[PDB]
Amino acid sequence: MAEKVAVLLGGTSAEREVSLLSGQAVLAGLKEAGIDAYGVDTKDFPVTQLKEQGFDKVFIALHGRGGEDGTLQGVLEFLQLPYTGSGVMASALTMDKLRTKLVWQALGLPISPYVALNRQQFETLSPEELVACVAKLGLPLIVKPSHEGSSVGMSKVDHASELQKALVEAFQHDSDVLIEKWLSGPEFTVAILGDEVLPSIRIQPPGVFYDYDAKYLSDKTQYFCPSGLSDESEQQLAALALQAYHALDCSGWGRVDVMQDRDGHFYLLEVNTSPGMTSHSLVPMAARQYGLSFSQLVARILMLAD
Amino acid sequence: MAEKVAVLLGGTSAEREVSLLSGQAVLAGLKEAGIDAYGVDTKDFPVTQLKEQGFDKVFIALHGRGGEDGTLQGVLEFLQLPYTGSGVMASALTMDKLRTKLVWQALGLPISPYVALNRQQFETLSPEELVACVAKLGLPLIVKPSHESSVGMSKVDHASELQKALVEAFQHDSDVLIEKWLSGPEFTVAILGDEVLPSIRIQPPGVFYDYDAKSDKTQYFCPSGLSDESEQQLAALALQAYHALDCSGWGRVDVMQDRDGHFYLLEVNTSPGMTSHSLVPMAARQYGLSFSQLVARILMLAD
Ligand SMILES: Nc1ncnc2c1ncn2[C@@H]1O[C@H](COP(=O)(O)O)[C@@H](O)[C@H]1O
Ligand SMILES: Nc1ncnc2c1ncn2[C@@H]1O[C@H](COP(=O)(O)O)[C@@H](O)[C@H]1O
Ligand code: NA
Ligand code: NA
Ligand code: NA
Numbered sequence: 001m002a003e004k005v006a007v008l009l010g011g012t013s014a015e016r017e018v019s020l021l022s023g024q025a026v027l028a029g030l031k032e033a034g035i036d037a038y039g040v041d042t043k044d045f046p047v048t049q050l051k052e053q054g055f056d057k058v059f060i061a062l063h064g065r066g067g068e069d070g071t072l073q074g075v076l077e078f079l080q081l082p083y084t085g086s087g088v089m090a091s092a093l094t095m096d097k098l099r100t101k102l103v104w105q106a107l108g109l110p111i112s113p114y115v116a117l118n119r120q121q122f123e124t125l126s127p128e129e130l131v132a133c134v135a136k137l138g139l140p141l142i143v144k145p146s147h148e149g150s151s152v153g154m155s156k157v158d159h160a161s162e163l164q165k166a167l168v169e170a171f172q173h174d175s176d177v178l179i180e181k182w183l184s185g186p187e188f189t190v191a192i193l194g195d196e197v198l199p200s201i202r203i204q205p206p207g208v209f210y211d212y213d214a215k216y217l218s219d220k221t222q223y224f225c226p227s228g229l230s231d232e233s234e235q236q237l238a239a240l241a242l243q244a245y246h247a248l249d250c251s252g253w254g255r256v257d258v259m260q261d262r263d264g265h266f267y268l269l270e271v272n273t274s275p276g277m278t279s280h281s282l283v284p285m286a287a288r289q290y291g292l293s294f295s296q297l298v299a300r301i302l303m304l305a306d
Numbered sequence: 307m308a309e310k311v312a313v314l315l316g317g318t319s320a321e322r323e324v325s326l327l328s329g330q331a332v333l334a335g336l337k338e339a340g341i342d343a344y345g346v347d348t349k350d351f352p353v354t355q356l357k358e359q360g361f362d363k364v365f366i367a368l369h370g371r372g373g374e375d376g377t378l379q380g381v382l383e384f385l386q387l388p389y390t391g392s393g394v395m396a397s398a399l400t401m402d403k404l405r406t407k408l409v410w411q412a413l414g415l416p417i418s419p420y421v422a423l424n425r426q427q428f429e430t431l432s433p434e435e436l437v438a439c440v441a442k443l444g445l446p447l448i449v450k451p452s453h454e455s456s457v458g459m460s461k462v463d464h465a466s467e468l469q470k471a472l473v474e475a476f477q478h479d480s481d482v483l484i485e486k487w488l489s490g491p492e493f494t495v496a497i498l499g500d501e502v503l504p505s506i507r508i509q510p511p512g513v514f515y516d517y518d519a520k521s522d523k524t525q526y527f528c529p530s531g532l533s534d535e536s537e538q539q540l541a542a543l544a545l546q547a548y549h550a551l552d553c554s555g556w557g558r559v560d561v562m563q564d565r566d567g568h569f570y571l572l573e574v575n576t577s578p579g580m581t582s583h584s585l586v587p588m589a590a591r592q593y594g595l596s597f598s599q600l601v602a603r604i605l606m607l608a609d
Contacts, residue, residue: 046384048354048385066384070394070395070398071383071384072380073380074377074380074383074384075380077372077380078372088377088380088394088398089395089398089399089401089402092376092398102408102409102412103408103412105412106407106408106411106412246424249402
């Protein structure tokens with residue numbers, strides 16, 4: 001019989017409202033393609049019952065916790081249902097910004113100079129020792145929790161005297177914290193669809209961070225596709241992005257986040273393994289510039305689930 | 307109302323028979339400690355219904371696929387049931403010999419000199435170019451799939467044997483590793499929470515400690531023969547390796563020495579065997595734990 005496809009949407013993360021909109025858009029595009037798709041709001045329906053309900057394949061339009069972090073991927077693996085996007089390991093690994101950075105560094109891929117600190121060091125070290133620990137990074141600094149957490153707990157530290165309060169804030173959210181040399185920007189994202197690298201997008205957040213307000217709420221964020229990069233720089237960025245995505249064992253689709261420093265060198269930030277899928281979200285924008293309609297995009301993502 | 311504990315055992319992986327034994331043992335030990343535990347053969351009972359069935363906490367005594375690789379951990383995270391051993395990421399990461407190696411490498415942890423090949427490379431490059439890729443490693447070499455001790459491993463003694471090995475490895479995975487051969491001896495270090503248990507020296511019948519080994523020629527030595535000072539160095543290295551991969555609860559770290567007596571990290575196993583002939587129970591005996599104490603302490607680390 002024809003495949004019955006579940007579009008997982010909404011859920012219970014902070015990104016619920018955006019996921020409802022992703023899932024709505026995905027459903028309409030699947031419908032336009034003639035795919036027998038059904039919206040499943042996982043706040044109300046347990047994912048562990050999908051095989052029992054008669055689904056054959058899963059389109060993941062969830063964002064954040066319980067959607068893009070390996071938990072859901074593990075449930076679908078247990079159910080033996082094919083599903084979109086990256087597998088368990090890559091989905092979880094991409095949430096862990098420390099271990100993402102370790103993998104990339106071992107491979108020789110570029111990341112901003114940084115220092116990692118765990119809670120037992122933080123409790124053991126004085127403020128002045130903590131300042132000395134990061135002095136090699138210069139000023140300003142970015143301090144963040146190591147794990148992805150809807151953008152929370154990050155600070156830009158302009159003076160050494162401010163480090164302590166930034167560490168206290170970050171350690172409210174995670175027991176590993178990262179202190180990074182500040183990158184000037186600009187910021188970019190590079191969508192990946194199976195083998196294919198899509199046109200980059202330049203991202204201009206309204207504030208210091210491309211955070212939850214910037215990504216999902218504000219109209220002040222600006223995006224540029226094409227990005228403005230030269231052909232030679234676009235080629236270099238594309239190859240870098242694909243290397244970063246493979247480094248983490250990603251598959252199906254995703255997006256790689258990159259920033260430049262003052263001299264134009266690219267640095268890798270992270271990979272998003274369940275990107276927004278509203279009609280004007282990044283991946284649909286990159287895909288339209290590449291030549292795919294929204295419908296074709298979601299059909300392709302789904303064809304890559306096997 | 308005492309907590310009701312499921313001991314997940316058997317399942318459907320290649321390791322099912324071993325897992326039945328591990329599970330049987332675990333179940334007996336938990337009950338011996340006063341825990342209200344039940345055996346649950348996951349071949350017959352779906353892990354998705356554990357909460358519906360009234361279970362409060364889970365001891366995972368499954369091995370291999372669907373047991374120690376993150377998939378089960380994802381289901382138990384969804385159900386919000388506390389469980390033994392490492393979480394989703396560490397459980398999955400520890401299956402990937404490549405990305406394990408990369409994490410350890412970036413932290414400055416000791417691993418055998420190696421060269422990683424992806425498939426683009428195998429199929430592009432000619433047999434002579436591939437010999438040349440790994441020249442700097444010398445001889446002899448081990449060739450292995452990045453996932454799965456199972457199939458696909460070779461020992462390569464001359465450059466001319468390499469192609470054959472790369473072909474056997476690439477039947478099984480698209481990241482393949484070529485490493486400098488380490489002389490041994492080989493050791494394993496069980497970790498229980500924060501505590502490192504006494505090391506075990508492992509003498510396999512042949513070249514690999516690999517399943518047939520995990521024969522009845524396989525020999526284990528505990529004490530391992532290391533000095534107190536080396537045991538301390540090993541214990542610290544092992545803990546660092548385990549924490550590097552985000553492991554928790556318990557597990558086993560596999561390490562080898564080289565010709566200069568330095569230790570090199572091999573892998574971390576996140577759901578170890580618990581049979582009468584298994585390594586973690588032997589280390590636990592050596593530390594002065596009963597098997598019942600051992601399993602209760604592992605369960606106590608689940609919350
Ligand atoms: N080292 C850095 N320097 C400047 N901006 C950063 C840095 N790290 C993160 N950001 C900003 O914070 C956002 C979220 O950080 P992250 O989740 O680490 O990518 C990025 O998309 C950037 O806008
Ligand atoms: N580089 C190496 N040199 C020597 N023996 C190895 C090497 N790598 C693996 N082995 C053997 O193969 C077994 C399984 O390897 P692994 O799956 O990488 O942990 C180990 O327990 C060792 O007995
Ligand atoms: Na992810
Ligand atoms: Na529109
Ligand atoms: Na594992």
